[PDB]
Each structure stands twice: as structure tokens, then as C-alpha cells.
Amino acid sequence: MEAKAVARTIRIAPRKVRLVLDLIRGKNAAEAIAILKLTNKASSPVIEKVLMSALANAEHNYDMNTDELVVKEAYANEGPTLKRFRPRAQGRASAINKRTSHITIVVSDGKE
Amino acid sequence: PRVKGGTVTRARRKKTIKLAKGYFGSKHTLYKVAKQQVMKSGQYAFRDRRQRKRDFRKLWITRINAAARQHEMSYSRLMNGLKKAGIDINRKMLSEIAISDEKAFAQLVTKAKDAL
Amino acid sequence: MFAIIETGGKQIKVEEGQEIFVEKLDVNEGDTFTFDKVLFVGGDSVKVGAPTVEGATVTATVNKQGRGKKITVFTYKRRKNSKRKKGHRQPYTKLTIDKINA
Amino acid sequence: MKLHELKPAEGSRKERNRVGRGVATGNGKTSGRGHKGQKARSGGGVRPG
Amino acid sequence: AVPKRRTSKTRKNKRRTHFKISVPGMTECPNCGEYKLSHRVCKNCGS
Amino acid sequence: MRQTFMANESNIERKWYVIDAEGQTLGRLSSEVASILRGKNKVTYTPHVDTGDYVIVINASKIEFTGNKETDKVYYRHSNHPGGIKSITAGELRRTNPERLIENSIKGMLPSTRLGEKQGKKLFVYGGAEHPHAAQQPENYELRG
RNA sequence: UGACCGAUAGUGAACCAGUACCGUGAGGGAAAGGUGAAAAGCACCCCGGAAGGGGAGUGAAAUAGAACCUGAAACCGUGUGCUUACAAGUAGUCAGAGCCCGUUAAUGGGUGAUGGCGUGCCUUUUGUAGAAUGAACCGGCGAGUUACGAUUUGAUGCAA
RNA sequence: GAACAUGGGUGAUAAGGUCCGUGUUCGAAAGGGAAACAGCCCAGACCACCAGCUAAGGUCCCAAAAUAUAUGUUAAGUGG
RNA sequence: UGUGGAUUGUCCUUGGACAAUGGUAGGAGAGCGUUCUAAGGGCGUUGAAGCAUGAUCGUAAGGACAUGUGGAGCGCUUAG
């Protein structure tokens, strides 16, 4: 049995939230939150909230253990981006993109 | 009646991308480069389809020349005497016998040695 | 034991109990073709002959007689506007040896 | 005859020749008009005489 | 001053081989059921 | 396609030979060694696998050459540096480090492929001292065609 | 009424059109259709300040939840079988070990230690691997047509 | 239109120069030899094959085939 | 040259032939597929069109058939 939890649309570049997802992959939940409460990244408290919500999904729906839990998969898909504009010199103007992410995390127990 | 194109331009473009399966880089994704690589593959296969009958032929000669120097003889001489004794044998068969039943080959050398 | 027969336009080597592929023969499926042109015969009695050995190969049962794999032949010019595309399927006959005469 | 098996006279109707539709037809790209000059221009050519 | 050719997905993923972050010290608190920073203190981590 | 024996690994066996260059003329004793290193003297030689045996010399300080090539025929070498032409050694380099002399000569008649470089690592030349490979039971080839 | 169009088509405009917007002014002038048969538009419980999830419930369907019929490429990711740190490369093709597979059943399929051969594509040229021109990639659209005459060829009807 | 070989003019019995004449090849021709080399030598690809005989050029190693035989010539690495 | 096959133009008047089959600008001939109409006969909630995958069939442009996704139309034969 396994539990999952998706955020769906987050104001943060997907390439910047993929640098903190390669540190809590294939580890214990207890050590996972500890590593997320030490990194000084901008996407550290966001991932923690999702990871903390996924651990509560297998405590009321499946009512399983918490100490004997391991994060199985953890990725982040791209989402819709907003188009902006920035005035440059000589009248010409450039373009700005505001991409979003779809952070997802599934928790298992080391067995299918 | 206006005949708008569709389900015919992608059906023929999906048949050229399937032929370029196993290429490195974007030569198995983009169709503009896949067509060029598939257009050269056919020109190569046909060009080395006649070069395969020259490599194997040269291979047998090298093998027969190495199995003829053990009996104090030369390929040129061995062949010359093998044609003077009226013997019709392929170069692929001669080398096949030398690698297998050595006794047979040994006797053949003697037959082409007294025919000189 | 092993003989050196020659059919179609080349020469082969039977082992008295091994399947071989040759050119389209003038027979039918489940027939019996016999090669009357041996160039060499050794293994137990090294017997080499000039034109032949006066010993036609034992009749070999004929099996599958269909077409081969399809190959595509393509060719084009450099800066010229010329190209050609065709398909080929060389026919063949499958048979197995069981005996041998000398 | 029938309206679902009617056939026309042999060698009575032919297909029109469409120019510029490939290189296999033999009448594409230049569409049998040469290379350059004033006879290869759209609506070009001198007066008849 | 301008790229002559475009980079591929293999040469771009080869340059991002060292681009990563290192793990922290994580000085486990003696007895408080929390986590204190290396040579630091917290309101939860007693030690 | 048909029947053509193809030599592979765990099916071929290599041996050890010992040649002596006492009264040889370098070049003539080099072409006969290259063939043995390439394994072009066997009936089961394939051009896609490493076939052949190892060769060992014991007299690289006795090699001789006819003509005035002992004073001429200088050896050049560059170091990828502005004016790095190195020609200190000429034809009388058989007295100082003569092992390289034969080594290069026999390495100049082999293919420059990925398999032609590993085939040139099966040759051991010695100035005049005896070889320490007595646990390989090397056969004495000496006599050359 | 139609061998007329069916959302880049047909009117510039199927919807917020001469409207956003642009110019002192005359003026120029877009983009944008589709949940389901019926809102029955997720009551309730759990994590979070909220957004959004996980169960449950409504329905034939919830990967039909208003980024709402179908959902193709370019592009971005996670898992996994075989392979890679002495090597010079228009990246393929011919031959060929080893290690895994099992089909529209056939002298099957995936991967590739080594060997031989090999300077992209279009245009313009006496001649282009060319250090001559064009194209970042993918998808949609984009060039011998019709009316009336002249001459020649095939087909059919009647024939001085 | 171009090179190659010949027959001339022009220029300096200069030019991968320029203008005519007679042939061949390239243009519109792949394959083998000249180390690489549209125009030089040999030869004109309907398709299959792990068959055989030859042309120019070649036979110590790279790299298919003589470390062939007989006779002279050459001491410069001439060959190159 | 040997052995099997494809196309022609001939020939002889049913398959052995006889020859022949590099190709640019061009000339001539035979075909494949797309949208709509007519007639005849068909398929479809027991799942149409589209989309994805496959080791299949034809001398080429191409054509079938299973399996997954999808939820209402679409093929085939002759001619225009």
C-alpha cells in the first residue's frame, strides 16, 4: 500500500524546485523532514508542507505506521506559464516568463 | 468542393520516423533530419551490397595462403598446380576443409605437387 | 561422411543430417531431389575427383518452398533531381540430407 | 446498361496533365519552362510575330 | 560574441553535473526530540 | 549467410616465441615479426578479433644496416612547442637505449586502430640482457623464412 | 435552393467588432465557439492561514471538476533491461562475439566488445564538403486556373 | 562551356592567359588505378547470391597476390 | 560467365526465346491516394471516425488485421 499528495500549480520555477527533490529521494520520512528543516532554499517549507500532508493521508485512510515509512517517488512536472513584458532601450521591449510547478510525492513502506 | 489536407501528411511522416529507430541525438525525433539519414542509409546498403563479395573472397585467400605455407608451398604455386590437375573447387570450400579435416587438405597438396 | 555438392551456381557442404538453402529447384513440397554432381567426398575415405567421383548425392527430401525476406533498394543523385525505390524477394527452397553415396 | 456498372468508350477520355506536383512526374519545380530568360516569367513572352 | 551553433540535450546535461547543493551537518539534539544546526541552537532542540 | 568459421574468445590459444637479432638487417627482421604479432600465419585468422602470439628479442644491440644509413637516417620528434624539433639521435642511437630503435621500427608496420595498438603491446625487446620470462616457457623461433 | 464554407475556412466581426489597442489628425484595425441527457457544480471526515490535495458521495463515465468532447508533434520529467572514464567521431551502413527477451512464427526481436568503407540537404554554376545562398525546432496554411475564340489529336453519329 | 592531346594566330617558342580548327572524356557517369584529385588511364550500374575468368595497375609490412627464375646496369639512398 | 527472378520492345504467332534497360533541360505512356456527387450493396453502443503500438502484405506511390484509448458515424464496387 502507498499514499500520494499533489500540490497542483505553485508560483516557483520547476528547475529551482528540482534541486531540493534530489536530496529527499529514497530516504526515511523522519530524516526527510529533518533535511528539509535545515536547507535555506526558497522551496524548502513548500515541499515540507506537501510531504507532511502525504504522511497524514496514510494515518487516517490506511492507519499504517509512521516511523516505518520511506518516500518512494518524488518529482515535479511543469505547469501553465504567464507572459510579461519589460521595456528595454531604443523603444524595443523584451519578454518575461513566470513558469509554475506540479510537485508530487508518494510514500510507501518498502513493499507493494 | 474545398479538400483540406489531414490524416495523410502525418501518416507518411510517421513511417519515415519509425525507419530511423536507434539513431543518436535528434536523428530519431525530428523528421527533417530523419529523412536525410534514411535517404543516405539506402545509398550505403546498396553500395556495400557488392563490397561484401570482395571482403569474404579476400578472407578465404588469406586463410588458404597460411595453410599452404606449412607444407613448404605458395598460394600462387598451389593454385597453379591445382588447375593443371583438372580440379574444380571454390576458395570458400578449400579454406573450409583446411580449418576442418586437415588430413583431406594434406592429400590435396600432394595431388597438386606431383601435377607440376 | 561429408561431401561437397554444387547446385544452382555455387558449391555447398552437407553433413548427412543438416538443413540447407539453395536456389528455386524444379520440384514440389514433400518431393525427393537427387544431386548427380559431386566434386569431393572425404571424412572416412578421402576421394577427390577431377570432373566428379561417379557417385550422385543421396536423394534429399524437399521441404518449405516459399519466398525470402523483402529488401528495399534505394538510390538518389546529389544536386540532381533523380531517385529510384524498388522491392525484392529472392525465392528459395528448404531441404534436409539423410543419406550419402560414393 | 445499369446506373451502377456503366462504362465509357475505350480511349475516349483521358486524365489532364498537372504540372508542378513532384519530381517523379517529370514536370515539377521548373514545370518544363527552362531555367531563366523572359519566356520563364509569369505571363511573359513576345507578341505573336 | 554569439553562439555559432545550438547546444544539444546531451552537452547541456553534461554541464549540469556539478550544479547541485551539499547535505547539511544536522547535529542531532542530545535529548529534546528536535534538530539543532551545527554549532548553533533552536527553541525546540534543547542541546 | 552460409558456412564460414569465425574465431572468437575462449576458442583460440596464444604461445610465446624468442627471436635473436645477431646478424639481421632490422627491416628484414621487422616485417617477419609484424606478421606473427598480427597472427597472419594461422588457418583460423579473423580481422575482428586479437589472433596471434607474443614475440621476445634478446639481441637489440647487434642489429646492423648496410649502406651509409648508420651516419644518416636521423630520427625527428616534435613537442608541440615553437621550435621543438628534436633530432639529437641519428643512426648511431644503437649504443644508447637500442630497445626503442627496434620497438619503433616494428611499431611502424602495424595498423593505427584500437585493436592495432593493443596488438603492439605483446612485444618485449631487450638490448642484450636475457629476458626474465622463464615462467612462460617461450619456444625458440630464431630461424626466419 | 446548392458534386458552396464548417472556427488559421466563411464577412474585418458565429463570442465582449468597427470593440482592446495605435496616431496631434485624415486613418489603421486584432485575438477569442464545444462539461453533462439533467447542476444532480463534489454534503460530510483528514492535512494546510489559504490555495490545493486524499477518502467519500452524484453520474453510464471524475485521467467529463468550469486550464472542463477527442488530445497529435516540438519540449520537460521518474522508473527500468543492455552498454560506457587510452579515446580523433557528416555519427550511418556491411560483417560480428557476449548478456537479456518471446512475435502478425520467421533462415525472430532489443542492446553493441572489435573490423572494413564513408567530407549533410536545396539553389545557382565550366566546376560547390565548400570559408557562395537559404532554413532554431514542430504543427496548420501557401503557386499553370476559368470565360470566350483559333489550330491539331483521340472517340462517337450521319455522310456529298 | 571546361580540361587533356595534337594543328596555328596573338603575347615574351610567359600564364590554370586569349581566340579559331580536328578528336575524346566531364557537363548528364557510378565502378577500379594515379596516397587525397569534375576533364588523365581501364571500363558504361535492370535486381538476388558468403560462385568463376580477366583489364589498367600491381605481388617484404600497413594492405589481395613471387622475399619467383635467368641475365646484365648502377654505390648515389641515384631511384624519390 | 554461371544460377534464379522483373519489365519491355520484338518475335512464336504461350512460354522458350531474340535482343535491350546510366542519365540533367525536355517529349511520350501506365498508375496510387485525398474531398464531394450518383447508383447498387454493406458495417455500427455486442462500439464508427480519429489517436497509439506491432516481428504483416504489394515492383513503387500504398493496403489490410488484431490490441489499447475514444463515444457517433463511416467503408466497399463502377463512373463523374
Automatic annotation (TrEMBL), chain B:
Keywords: Ribonucleoprotein, Ribosomal protein, RNA-binding, rRNA-binding. Transmembrane segments: none annotated. The keyword Transcription regulation does not apply. It comes from the Bacteria. One of its GO terms (biological process) is ribosomal large subunit assembly. The keyword Transcription regulation does not apply. GO terms for molecular function: rRNA binding; structural constituent of ribosome. GO terms for cellular component: ribonucleoprotein complex; ribosome. Belongs to the bacterial ribosomal protein bL20 family. This is Large ribosomal subunit protein bL20. It comes from Staphylococcus schweitzeri. The gene is rplT.
From TrEMBL, chain C:
InterPro entries: bL21-like, bL21-like_sf, Ribosomal_bL21. Belongs to the bacterial ribosomal protein bL21 family. HAMAP family: Ribosomal_bL21. The keyword Nucleotide-binding does not apply. Residues 80-91 have a biased composition (Basic residues). It comes from the Bacteria. Keywords: Ribonucleoprotein, Ribosomal protein, RNA-binding, rRNA-binding. GO terms for biological process: translation. Part of the 50S ribosomal subunit. Contacts protein L20. GO terms for cellular component: cytoplasm; ribonucleoprotein complex; ribosome. This is Large ribosomal subunit protein bL21. Residues 80-102 are annotated as: Disordered. NCBIfam families: L21 (TIGR00061). GO terms for molecular function: rRNA binding; structural constituent of ribosome. This protein binds to 23S rRNA in the presence of protein L20.
From TrEMBL, chain D:
It comes from the Bacteria. Residues 42-49 have a biased composition (Gly residues). Residues 1-18 have a biased composition (Basic and acidic residues). Residues 1-49 are annotated as: Disordered. Coiled coil: none annotated. Belongs to the universal ribosomal protein uL15 family. Part of the 50S ribosomal subunit. Binds to the 23S rRNA. This is Large ribosomal subunit protein uL15. It comes from Staphylococcus schweitzeri. The gene is rplO.
Automatic annotation (TrEMBL), chain F:
Keywords: Ribonucleoprotein, Ribosomal protein. GO terms for cellular component: cytosolic large ribosomal subunit. InterPro entries: Ribosomal_uL13 (IPR005822), Ribosomal_uL13_bac-type (IPR005823), Ribosomal_uL13_CS (IPR023563), Ribosomal_uL13_sf (IPR036899). It comes from the Bacteria. GO terms for biological process: negative regulation of translation; translation. GO terms for molecular function: mRNA binding; structural constituent of ribosome. This protein is one of the early assembly proteins of the 50S ribosomal subunit, although it is not seen to bind rRNA by itself. It is important during the early stages of 50S assembly. PANTHER family: LARGE RIBOSOMAL SUBUNIT PROTEIN UL13M, RIBOSOMAL PROTEIN L13. Part of the 50S ribosomal subunit. Belongs to the universal ribosomal protein uL13 family. This is Large ribosomal subunit protein uL13. The lineage of its organism: Bacteria, Bacillati, Bacillota, Bacilli, Bacillales. The gene is rplM.
